[PDB]
Amino acid sequence: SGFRKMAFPSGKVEGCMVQVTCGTTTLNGLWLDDVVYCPRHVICTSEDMLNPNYEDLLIRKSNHNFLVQAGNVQLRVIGHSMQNCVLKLKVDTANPKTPKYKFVRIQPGQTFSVLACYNGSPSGVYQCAMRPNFTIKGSFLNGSCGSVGFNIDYDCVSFCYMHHMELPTGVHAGTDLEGNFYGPFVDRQTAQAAGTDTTITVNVLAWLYAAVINGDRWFLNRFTTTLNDFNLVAMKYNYEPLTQDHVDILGPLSAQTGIAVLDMCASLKELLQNGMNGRTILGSALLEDEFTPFDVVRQCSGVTFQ
Amino acid sequence: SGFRKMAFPSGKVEGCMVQVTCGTTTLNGLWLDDVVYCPRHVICTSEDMLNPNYEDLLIRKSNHNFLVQAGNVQLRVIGHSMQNCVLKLKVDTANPKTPKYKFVRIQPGQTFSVLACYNGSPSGVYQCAMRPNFTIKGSFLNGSCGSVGFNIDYDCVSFCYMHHMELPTGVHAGTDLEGNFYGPFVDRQTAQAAGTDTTITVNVLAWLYAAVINGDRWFLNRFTTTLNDFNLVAMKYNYEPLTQDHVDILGPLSAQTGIAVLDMCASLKELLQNGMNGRTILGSALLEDEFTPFDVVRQCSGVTFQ
């Protein structure tokens, strides 16, 4: 029993984190095979941040301008190139701890683990969701750029996020590992704003199923609603609309608890219109939307990883 | 003078289009160096489309199940792999007409040219925009999957779109060339719906500047507004809000016409609240939002390409 904000074990990723220095700027890089990946704004000085011209800035660099350190061992840079917003540094030594990996782009509402790093050394791991407005509510301080987000499927690490910057509102923005930003952001130090966020409805429903599995049942009722009647109420409270695909995804949780998805939606409808009246669900006084249906199954059924 | 829906010259892309057959299914592929890229649903039969298991379907295939034809010449497949939603077919011959290229992911509101193909042979070229809901309003018939979208920057082709499917509403969905879908869509033949579309405000303003450059001035006025007052009106008409970054992007057009961006916004505000009263702008009776500021500069200043 129990339910926690659970991250993936980080060991396979810790062995890939390096420190990348260019000039007086230091941040984190990801070392897979003989390539080191890092945010391209490592080549920027204070004079360039407001409006960098990355093509000009990169042509004025040579391989020896890039200092890469894997702990104590220094890695010799033998080539460099830019792929969108990511710098790719070819090094002379292939990482012997390279796991089986792939680069995936995730969708809003999906979760992943973040390995927060400073000076190439891992500091902590936590779980977060990609918000509907393509930001993440992370925890990052100065020097954290190049920290990566990942999921583990079996023996394979799926890299999905590299950290680039913090927005004025305190939320965080980055790219996939091909260097393409999540959301309408650019790697310049100008004032950019995120669009309005919404609540991830399918995730709230998965979390309510987790509550039932763990013995929290006070919010259930005998009523049922339709997909259209629910979505009418959800839109008024800034909730993402619910699709038949979402209903199908919740299937394993509906079967395990014997509570139909549309039954659970009627309970959610009541919680939105009347609040929780000072009661809690799984130790929270708010509706939690950063657990996917798969996260709940994993933690309430026990999947491991090799 | 004049203003047309102008596409990029397609010659560099026509030489990369091939036909890919797997079983009784034929579609288009993109042949760059010694790799052919095509939608992975080429390996699906009628029995698999509703809920394909692509990992199982692919392991049951061998290289000789894939027939690749570049016109008359047949290409020998010597390897295959899956990258997200794209199949990568290694062939024995590198494409001698491979241009300088890169894979980019574009943002909603950006435009690109589509080379529509059937049986590996180019049929037509047209310009379109990536909509805010991550669909495109294309023109595709049966057999068009694997057609690509692209921009040309100097001598380099930036591939940004590969066509995968048509949604029930008649709009089109696809992936970038790394196989990651634009929008919350999956390559299954289930009923998926796009979110509500909005009008791309910065593009409408660029088009109004194009009208002024070409002598259409009847909609101008002496008024001016603020960014906040305009965005208040824009939200009511399902227009994307306008950012200071957008204002900066329109700079070259404001300078060439001597009409400040905020002046033009006041004209747009009037057109939204009163309509066009049976008058036209650049031969249209609606506000056009599929030309970017860069498209307008290119066509009203004359950039070519090598």
Ligand SMILES: O=Cc1ccc(N2CCN(C(=O)C3=NC(=O)NC(=O)C3)CC2)cc1Cl
């Ligand atoms: O030339 C472009 C450019 C240059 C530098 C830059 N920064 C690097 C240093 N930063 C940090 O280490 C963070 N500090 C925080 O407080 N929070 C974080 O999440 C990360 C800030 C971003 C961003 C850009 Cl776009």
Ligand SMILES: O=Cc1ccc(N2CCN(C(=O)C3=NC(=O)NC(=O)C3)CC2)cc1Cl
């Ligand atoms: O197993 C998954 C799967 C299998 C097949 C599939 N199709 C291929 C044939 N199609 C076409 O050639 C189009 N016909 C149109 O009418 N318009 C278009 O834009 C394209 C339809 C899509 C899609 C999926 Cl997702």
